[PDB]
Design a protein around this ligand. Structure first.
Ligand code: W2X
Ligand code: FE2
Length: 329
């Protein structure tokens, strides 16, 4: 069998308050988890994940093929050249099982300075018709802000963990310009399940998505209660237990860059499971021009031989590379 990965449950509630000592004790837990498998579950996070799941299910199960084309990103619909990131990512029956809906910062409106400039990675969200999906847009926008708030708190914990002041990351994570995204992923139950939609790892494990590091600062993930994720450790790939009451947290490769691999971006993959389930990541991205000077918390002078990299540069190049490596989702 595959061994269970160590994924501690960390009560992150102190990170919302003003008890600095208590925050330090949470930071230590984040440090330990980040230095070990690179994953932890944030518990006592304050978000109503059951309602998120319910609203997401109502959306996935009621949206029609017509609407999917009308909301599709450019990869599926040549008419929508502005939709690189935001919109619907279609399944391909008999070939590709997964489908999803991505949205960005609700503040990226037509008048936003980065939208006017047509800066890469900024787009205006697309939404289904309100009469067909009543309350969905409002719910989804509010969810963005709810998970932004959790993520800000988590970023205070990571900053303290690394020996910095608590706003070290969060000062670059701002409502007016964050490049963060929500993805509402549907993994279907299918009978029969098309072999073409199943990948096979070198070790023989059936997969829905191959090994990768995340393109993010951190990733803040809600998943249904169906085990599927695996993390590569020195002991090999290990199973990450499901917990549909908590958020699964890990670092992306921007964190690895900034910390000179002190907090690695864990390599992980998604096992194929024939189950109707949800995977709802929030990718914690900074602003387009955000640059944090790389450092090394294992070195006495804290200096690193990595060059500063703007977040916008990192993101545009990472999203493309991901598609090249593991395919268009
Ligand atoms: C490889 C990853 S981390 C997938 N992410 C992407 O494909 C990038 C989406 C970026 C988005 N379109 C944007 O524009 O921001 C992803 O979301 O995987 C989730 C899953 O497959 O369950 C789960 C997180 C498994 O790792
Ligand atoms: Fe991932």
């Amino acid at each position: 069998s595959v061994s269970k990965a160590n994924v501690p449950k960390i009560d992150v509630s102190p990170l919302f308050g003003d008890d600095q000592a208590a925050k330090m004790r949470v930071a230590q837990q984040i440090d330990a988890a980040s230095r070990d498998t690179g994953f932890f579950y944030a518990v006592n996070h304050g978000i109503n994940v059951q309602r998120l799941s319910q609203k997401t299910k109502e959306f996935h199960m009621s949206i029609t093929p017509e609407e999917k084309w009308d909301l599709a990103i450019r990869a599926y619909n040549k008419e929508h050249q502005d939709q690189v990131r935001a919109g619907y990512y279609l399944s391909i029956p008999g070939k590709k099982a997964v489908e999803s809906f991505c949205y960005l910062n609700p503040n990226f409106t037509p008048d936003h300075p980065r939208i006017q400039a047509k800066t890469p990675t900024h787009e205006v969200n697309v939404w289904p018709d309100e009469t067909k999906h009543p309350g969905f847009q409002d719910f989804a926008e509010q969810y963005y802000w709810d998970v932004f708030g959790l993520s800000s708190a988590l970023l205070k914990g990571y900053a303290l963990a690394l020996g910095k002041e608590e706003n070290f990351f969060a000062r670059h994570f701002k409502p007016d310009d964050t490049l963060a995204s929500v993805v509402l992923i549907r993994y279907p139950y299918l009978d029969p399940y098309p072999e073409a939609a199943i990948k096979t790892a070198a070790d023989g494990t059936k997969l829905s998505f191959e090994w990768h590091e995340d393109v993010s600062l951190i990733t803040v993930l809600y998943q249904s209660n169906v085990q599927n994720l695996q993390v590569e450790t020195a002991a090999g790939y290990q199973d990450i237990e499901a917990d549909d009451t908590g958020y699964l947290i890990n670092c992306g490769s921007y964190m690895a860059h900034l910390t000179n691999n002190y907090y690695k971006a864990p390599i992980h993959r998604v096992k194929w499971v024939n189950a109707e389930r949800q995977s709802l990541p929030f990718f914690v991205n900074l602003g387009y021009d955000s640059v944090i000077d790389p450092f090394d918390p294992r070195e006495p002078n804290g200096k690193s031989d990595r060059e500063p990299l703007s977040y916008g540069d990192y993101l545009q190049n990472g999203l493309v590379s991901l598609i090249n490596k593991n395919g268009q989702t």
